[PDB]
């Protein structure tokens, strides 16, 4: 048959093995676990914050299979059986999200913060069997949901490859949103009109591989580093918070070490005197054998017994002092390693204690000073002309950007021309168009949109045979 439906489940991580992905949601009101959404929505500074729900990791078989973390609709800014014309609807939180925070695939995290969000709506279609329905989410597997009233789900701690042991704190998250994964959030709730119908939000994220994760954190870091440069105004602060706990750290150290030097000198004195004892018992046992050596070469004298006995007394008395010696020495070692490892924390501390200073007053050294706003950034480049407002060059059909700008990050505005022969591109630098022959790619000149009048002739040096 179709989608080999499986074991029902509520709002957990569900590793399905590629095949066709089938979902069988066990109907029930949201559990208090996934309730973190509550604390999440907690009114924070405008941004997109989240919470690690589950964790991903070294699974099993040499095949790729994602996690279909579905979960009823409690994320819609307002829902109803709206008109079919709309294929996208907002939502206050988006579940399934491959976020690669510290160093792994966050099988889900709480995207819901001060940042608008919309999503697709696939309307499910009927099928062969009774309560099964294909709900083909544009970008991934079809998946046929199977909602069921009978609240009998899967209690066992999430399938192997997904440990709920995530640092359930609340932090922010960049691109990484659905990269190589997430890319699924879409209310499929639109079930016919007489079926297992209900407002359901399914999101399919791909179970990243060890490499891909790296192939992910890196980029995350790439973009972090970049923004960092553009925003020194804050980054320094992101640099200060990094020094605060840095010292907060070196302290918990100097402490837990003072403690070590503690238990150190503690087991010393003890094990030390514990030894001194042995020496004394030994000495005596020794000086005793002397008190009787005289009877030594007197095999038949009885007093020879005394001697013999003192011999044995000291042997034992010696081996005791032996182990007592070991104990003491070892102690003396740890005792040392300690006393030294402590001064280290002492050293380390100062190094940190100071650096914070070189990261605290340096904060104002980029906080105190005047910066300007958006409105300004807007005036820095002559605004591109509206394709339909480009005059005197015939008609124009915009075309894929490909020409690398010089500063910033996006390409230059391109539009075809002459039935596909002449290419134009907005030069925001001086506020003027630029022509390039199709095949050649050579610069034909600079025209003016209002009119289409040249203002500069062809320059053979200038050309961009760098774009199909």
């Amino acid at each position: 048959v179709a989608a080999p439906v499986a074991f029902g489940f509520p709002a957990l991580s569900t590793p399905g093995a590629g095949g066709l992905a089938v979902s069988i949601s066990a109907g029930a009101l949201s559990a208090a676990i996934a309730d973190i959404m509550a604390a999440l929505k907690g009114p924070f500074k405008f941004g997109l914050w989240g919470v690690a729900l589950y964790g991903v990791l070294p699974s099993q078989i040499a095949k790729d299979d994602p996690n279909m973390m579905s979960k009823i609709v409690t994320s819609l800014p307002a829902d109803d059986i709206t008109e079919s014309p709309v294929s996208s609807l907002p939502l206050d939180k988006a579940t399934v999200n491959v976020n690669v925070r510290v160093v792994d695939d966050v099988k889900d995290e709480r995207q819901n913060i001060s940042v608008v969000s919309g999503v697709p709506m696939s309307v499910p279609v009927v099928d062969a069997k009774p309560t099964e329905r294909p709900g083909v989410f544009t970008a991934s597997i079809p998946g046929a949901p199977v909602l069921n009233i009978s609240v009998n789900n899967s209690t066992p701690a999430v399938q192997t490859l997904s440990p709920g042991v995530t640092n359930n704190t609340d932090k922010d998250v960049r691109p990484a949103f659905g990269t190589q994964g997430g890319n699924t959030r879409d209310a499929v709730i639109r079930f016919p009109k007489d079926s297992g119908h209900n407002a359901v939000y399914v999101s399919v994220s791909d179970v990243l591989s060890p490499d891909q994760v790296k192939q992910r954190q890196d980029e995350e870091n790439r973009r972090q580093q970049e923004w960092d440069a553009t925003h020194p105004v804050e980054a320094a602060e992101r640099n200060y918070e990094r020094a605060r706990a840095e010292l907060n750290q070196a302290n918990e150290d100097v402490a837990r070490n003072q403690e070590r030097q503690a238990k150190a000198v503690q087991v010393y004195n003890s094990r030390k005197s514990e030894l001194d004892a042995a020496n004394k018992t030994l000495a005596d046992a020794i000086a005793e054998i002397k008190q009787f050596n005289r009877f030594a070469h007197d095999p038949m004298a009885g007093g020879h017994r005394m001697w013999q006995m003192a011999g044995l007394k000291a042997q034992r008395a010696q081996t005791d002092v032996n182990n007592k010696q070991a104990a003491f020495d070892a102690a003396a070692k740890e005792k040392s390693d300690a006393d030294a490892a402590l001064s280290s924390a002492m050293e380390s501390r100062k190094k940190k204690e100071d650096k914070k200073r070189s990261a605290e007053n340096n904060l104002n050294d980029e906080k105190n000073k005047p910066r300007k706003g958006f409105k300004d950034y807007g005036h820095d480049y002559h605004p591109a002309p509206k394709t339909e407002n480009i005059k005197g060059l015939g008609d124009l059909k915009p075309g894929i950007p490909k020409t690398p700008k010089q500063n910033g990050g996006g390409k230059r505005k391109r539009w075809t021309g002459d039935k596909g022969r002449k290419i134009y591109e907005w030069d925001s630098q001086h506020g003027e168009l630029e022509g390039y022959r199709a095949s050649d790619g050579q610069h034909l000149g600079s025209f003016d949109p209002k009119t289409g009048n040249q203002l500069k002739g062809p320059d053979p040096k200038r050309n961009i045979k760098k774009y199909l």
Binding site: P120, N183, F374, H382, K397, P398, I400, G410
Partner: protein, 84 residues
């Protein structure tokens, strides 16, 4: 008066398939901060390619179902004083 310029072509013929403007955001740079693109050298100066991760955050503003598996999408942050 900042606006978002969204343009798209066929993921095979590269042909222009369409373009829709966005409502004006006045001086609300925010939208850009949600995407990560810095203001510097990007306002009225660049045409970034819409990457999946972004759809969910852009869509909220374009009456267009961004079928990123059937088309290629690009976005520009154009800003003009006053209305337009």
């Amino acid at each position: 008066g900042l606006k978002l310029d969204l343009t798209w072509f066929d993921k095979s013929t590269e042909d222009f398939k369409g373009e829709e403007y966005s409502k004006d955001f006045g001086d609300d740079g925010s939208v850009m901060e949600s995407l990560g693109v810095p203001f510097k050298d990007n306002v009225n100066n660049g045409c970034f390619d819409v990457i999946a991760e972004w759809v969910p955050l852009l869509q909220p503003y374009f009456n267009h179902q961004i079928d990123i598996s059937d088309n290629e999408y690009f976005v520009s942050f154009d800003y003009r004083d006053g209305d337009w």
